[PDB]
């Protein structure tokens, strides 16, 4: 015997218990369980299960046997998940390979003795052999390789190993690429800032007593052709500073105008850069609820008491008409893999790939502390590796399921992410309906899937839902909610003698803190396969026409549709007032329509709507990534191309993402495109978001159009 | 004496749920949460415990109760969603009783005749300042219920008021030149003028129909066009589009193409047949139900709130965490949200004294004879309040929502209620916020919005609306569309026919023989926000990339160009999603003095096309008579009287009458009550995946305190 609510509870199972009907309900994830003290038998997901010792009750705590927990939940009875005899070729490296893919490249004598792993990732086989996998379970007969970057003091090096014969492929030291940020690099930064006399004496002077207190953050400095008087060989990173004051968020306690550039080859800091001297601001501002009570609520569950829709076999999803696969990487995430649409019993390729490519969140001040301020979130700082384990409940809703998922640390160990990515089903409305006047009403219940990922870096947290509708469209939403980067302000209120001169750059937002102005930009990569490989790029234009056909009416409602032809001329700005397609002029619905699926790049946000980069085409963040001022940018598919803002964008000099993919400008007819949407908030701030900051969204959608015959969602005829 | 448990459960309209394994009841009925064993002596309710003399009775397997045991229960009183209300809100819609009250005050007036029909009969509104006073301050309002009772003599409309408080007729006004909406009886006549036709049978049957008797025919308002159309300016007309029935259950998949009769309804005789080239009515059969589906397994999700509802319903008035707002019910426009404060710590302030459906138009793009009047104002011209649709329990709203009841008068002056004509429902909508420093314990709370959804049908449309209130103080306002499309009969199979691409100029075909005729949804919301005080003015920020002049590499910076706008007339605007538009109170700041302020999005994006203006040259009529159509953006001086964007009397009228009208006269609107007018919409470009049933197509605005508050709104109570 074992304590029942000690035993759950560790286990992570939620524990309910009804006097009334002297039942205990359990939940976890996909497994329901109702069991009763005394009964020899209990219910998991709706099915009777023989117990070998009931649930006692001694002193009125419930008691278990000591294999209770394997018994009933690993019982077989919940089917949420399933073994996946036959490994799919996109499953992520193991722990088992990511150690052995260290072995291999430590075991060369190329190998220098401090090295770090920036990421160590599947390299995938070839396309073409993915989806033979999935579509006709041919086995694809290449070896598990990985891709190996390692860092070497600031050095990159490309390696390539091969896991099934165990042996190194290619060493490949990479020029001129400066590496991301890793985790160790934020020691440093503090230690360093921390041992130096000038950074303290700076810190003095500007009012701080105890330099013990100073909080570093690190920041990759950009490229500015050395207008910034920073060496473009040394690996640099610039240190903004706060004071802890012990409210748990020195966020709300910048040092202003005090900027540290740091050598981390050197290990200390070659230039401290001074400004206008700004009282820090002390008050407290906690976001955690130390200093709040919250209001009694009302319970609230979404409970499925016979177990899922959804099936989990290894990585593999099915939910209804939908099946694909999710995988993990350290830098971008998710990534969604061999979506097929199942059409009546044939399955339909609809995407190939889909992940984030990457984002950026560039701030509009000039000033010493923030004009260089620029987050590559995922490309500089890795945003898998930061995944937010998701809080249950909370973070995703009361029937969810989280899943665990398994990376490389910088150093090459393993890395599993508790409850990395949620999966849960959702209510989403009424999915179709029509109460025709005198009639029988005809409603059909909405439900989407979500897999939803949260990653942190410093200040912001990022949540994105990858929306799978049953009738075929596929919704890809972004959160962002978190604590605002602040710039320490002399004025108090608006009515202050600075208020003005204060606020050209963001709101005032608290006494002596201005939420300075900036943008949040996404860019999703998304390898659309339309019905198959070969697909184009069609426009259609609703436009306004003179009336020719007679009669009192002087205009129409028509279209102008064209295909665009080539890359330069699919990187465009998005009118969500107009259609694009991408089809595939191969294949045909029932009426003669190419199937396509319609792209809107912008369907939606609670934030003011970027349209572009809020950048003069001369600067040089604006310059080096192009991806920010175009919302829809497609291209031919090349399987090194991943990085809307390129694979080593630290630094970097020129765009070596989507514009140098674009750049070529080949031509996108009757090819195997991919899409990649843009889509982007414009950030003011005010005082709702102090200090914390409530998520807000913006949307994305991908419809079938003309891809079906009817409604997907009636279902099979008898 | 007792009676069938689950059969008069199921009658009574609450979930049934048994449970063999723990020998329990699940019972849920909106606010109620019953658990119940067999033979047992008390039952559940929101977590109470309730006795029963009489207890569930087991009986070879059939569940009994006794015939008080609906009462004894849902009624008990442990489910305390609903409270009564002690003094009646001033805002509270005619009651049954004050609804033939009015009939009847004006059946005595020697001018009433017995033909009088009833457009709209709506409680006269009380003074603002005297409703807001009650709500918060709680002064009696001591001016007497009214009901404006808007008559349809014939085709003349007539408008009176009654003082129900002195049962006396105050005014009795002829309108002259304004025509009535549709009402119900419109319907059958036009259905019985064409069955009686002879020319029409003979029309129909040149078309290939071989029974008439099998000829649904429609009504549609005909609009205005200079007397282009050769239809007298002063009758009352209607025209008829007509479809065969086939026996699938969906006599719009099957259009009689090209055949167009005009009613006029004072005569009772089709004045005019339009007619066109002949085009085979689409035969094939295209039911919507299910009836020729497979129904798959589908396991069981349930939404429940074990121990009752956050929100309370005290008569009309709705009460939830920080809002307070009073819900009901116009015929024409549908629910009202009204005196809706935000609660600061004590003190109520307000945002709105009054919120609703302004008015909606659905124009089609398609020239042809069938198509080219074609532009429903549905609340306007059929009445969308009346038209409501009850709410399928479970599907059209989540199984946690209550389903309010709400009573109109029809149209020929009797009460008249509507089941499950409001759904009120709270829902998860993921993390409020989240910081997760590295490091440190999570910090995440869940954000949940309370949702008041009204649908309504007209003909072939279904649409949704979403009033959402978020905890943290933002208002969203979601319109939601489904139903069958009007579709246009054609000649072509697929688009390889030759006559596809002329087929499909104005539509896509979507079908065989089928084409989904191009058109635009474009809704209008009324708000007449008050942000915190009546008193208000209408700031623009627009941010810009302005140059550095400042020194350091950067050539450019964000920076924001702040300007009030003065007048209705520079109000009325188009809506950029990348600026914004504040209606603030220059009386009033936050703690940093900012002046507290709302941010207004009439786009805060959808899911079909979205509409940039009405797709119409700037020379067609409908383009004149309907101003409202082509800005997203418009603001008012608040006048008591201007409830209509498309005009208070839309049916064939010639010139604007409402935000045309209500601006022109470009008043300013620099600290003074403000009425906010947000107009969105989408384009509708047909697909195969929207036939025979289209899915639900969504469009979002939004309404957030902009420095309306000092902090993060819902950090919670201060504990210092
Ligand atoms: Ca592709
Ligand atoms: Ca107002
Ligand atoms: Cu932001
Ligand atoms: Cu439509
Ligand atoms: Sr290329
Ligand atoms: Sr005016």
Do not use: C
């Not at 803002?645 to 989507?658: A, F, V």
């Not at 959608?701 to 015959?709: H, M, Q, R």
């Amino acid at each position: 015997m074992v304590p029942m609510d000690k035993t759950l509870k560790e286990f992570g199972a939620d524990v309910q218990w009804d006097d009334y009907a002297q039942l205990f309900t359990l939940i976890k994830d996909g497994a329901y369980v109702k069991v009763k003290p005394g009964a020899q038998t209990a219910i998991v997901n709706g099915q009777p299960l023989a117990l070998q010792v009931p649930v006692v009750m001694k002193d009125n705590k419930a008691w278990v046997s000591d294999t209770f927990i394997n018994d009933v939940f690993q019982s077989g009875l919940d089917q949420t998940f399933q073994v996946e005899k036959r490994p799919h070729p996109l499953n992520a490296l193991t722990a088992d390979e990511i150690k052995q893919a260290v072995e291999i490249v430590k075991a060369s004598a190329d190998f220098k003795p401090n090295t770090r792993f920036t990421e160590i990732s599947l390299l995938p086989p070839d396309k073409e052999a993915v989806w033979a996998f999935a579509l006709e379970n041919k086995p694809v007969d290449q070896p598990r390789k990985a891709d190996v970057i390692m860092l070497d003091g600031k050095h990159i090096i490309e390696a390539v190993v091969d896991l099934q014969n165990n042996k190194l492929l290619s060493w490949q030291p990479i020029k001129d690429a400066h590496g991301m940020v890793l985790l160790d690099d934020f020691a440093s930064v503090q230690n360093i800032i921390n041992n130096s006399e000038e950074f303290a004496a700076a810190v003095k002077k500007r009012g701080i007593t105890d330099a013990k207190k100073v909080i570093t953050t690190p920041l990759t400095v950009g490229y500015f052709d050395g207008k910034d008087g920073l060496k473009q060989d040394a690996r640099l990173l610039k240190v903004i500073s706060y004071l802890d004051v012990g409210d748990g968020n020195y966020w709300a306690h910048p040092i202003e105008n005090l900027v540290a550039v740091v050598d981390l080859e050197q290990k200390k800091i070659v230039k401290i850069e001074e400004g206008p001297v700004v009282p820090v601001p002390m008050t407290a501002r906690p976001f955690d609820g130390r200093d709040r009570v919250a209001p009694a609520v009302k319970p609230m569950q979404i409970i499925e008491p016979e177990g899922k829709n959804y099936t989990i076999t290894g990585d593999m999803i099915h939910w209804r008409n939908w099946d694909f696969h999710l995988s993990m990487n350290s830098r971008v995430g998710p990534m969604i893999s061999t979506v097929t649409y199942n059409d009546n019993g044939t399955k339909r390729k609809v995407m190939y790939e889909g992940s984030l490519g990457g984002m950026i969140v560039p701030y509009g001040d000039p000033d010493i502390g923030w004009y260089f301020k620029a987050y590559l979130d995922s490309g500089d700082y890795g945003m898998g590796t930061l995944t937010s384990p998701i809080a249950r409940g909370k973070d995703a809703p009361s029937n969810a399921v989280l899943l665990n998922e398994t990376i490389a640390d910088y150093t090459g160990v393993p890395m599993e992410i508790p409850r990395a990515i949620a999966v849960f089903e959702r209510y989403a409305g009424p999915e179709y309906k029509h109460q025709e006047m005198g009639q029988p009403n005809v409603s059909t219940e909405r439900r989407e899937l979500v897999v939803r990922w949260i990653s942190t870096v410093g200040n912001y947290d990022y949540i994105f839902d990858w929306i799978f509708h049953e009738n075929g469209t596929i919704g890809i939403d972004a959160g962002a909610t978190g604590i605002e980067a602040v710039k320490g302000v002399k004025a108090k209120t608006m009515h202050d003698e600075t208020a003005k001169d204060d606020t050209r750059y963001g709101t005032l937002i608290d006494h002596n803190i201005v939420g300075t102005t900036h943008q949040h930009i996404y860019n999703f990569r998304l390898d659309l396969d339309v019905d198959g490989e070969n697909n184009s790029l069609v426009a259609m234009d609703p436009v306004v026409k003179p009336n020719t056909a007679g009669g009192p009416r002087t205009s129409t409602m028509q279209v102008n549709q064209y295909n665009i032809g080539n890359e330069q001329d699919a990187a465009q700005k998005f009118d969500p007032g107009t259609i694009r397609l991408l089809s595939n002029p191969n294949k045909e619905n029932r009426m003669g329509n190419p199937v396509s699926y319609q792209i809107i790049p912008y369907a939606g946000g609670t934030h003011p709507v970027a349209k572009g980069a809020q950048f003069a085409p001369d600067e040089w963040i604006y310059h080096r990534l192009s991806f920010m001022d175009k919302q829809l940018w497609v291209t031919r598919y090349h399987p090194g191309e991943r990085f809307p803002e390129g694979k080593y964008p630290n630094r970097s000099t020129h765009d070596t993402g989507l514009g140098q993919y674009s750049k070529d400008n080949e031509s996108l007819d009757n090819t195997d495109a991919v899409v990649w949407m843009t889509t982007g908030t414009t950030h003011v701030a005010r005082a709702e978001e102090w200090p914390i900051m409530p998520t807000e969204w913006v949307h994305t959608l991908l419809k079938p159009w003309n891809f079906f015959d009817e409604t997907p969602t009636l279902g099979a005829l008898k």
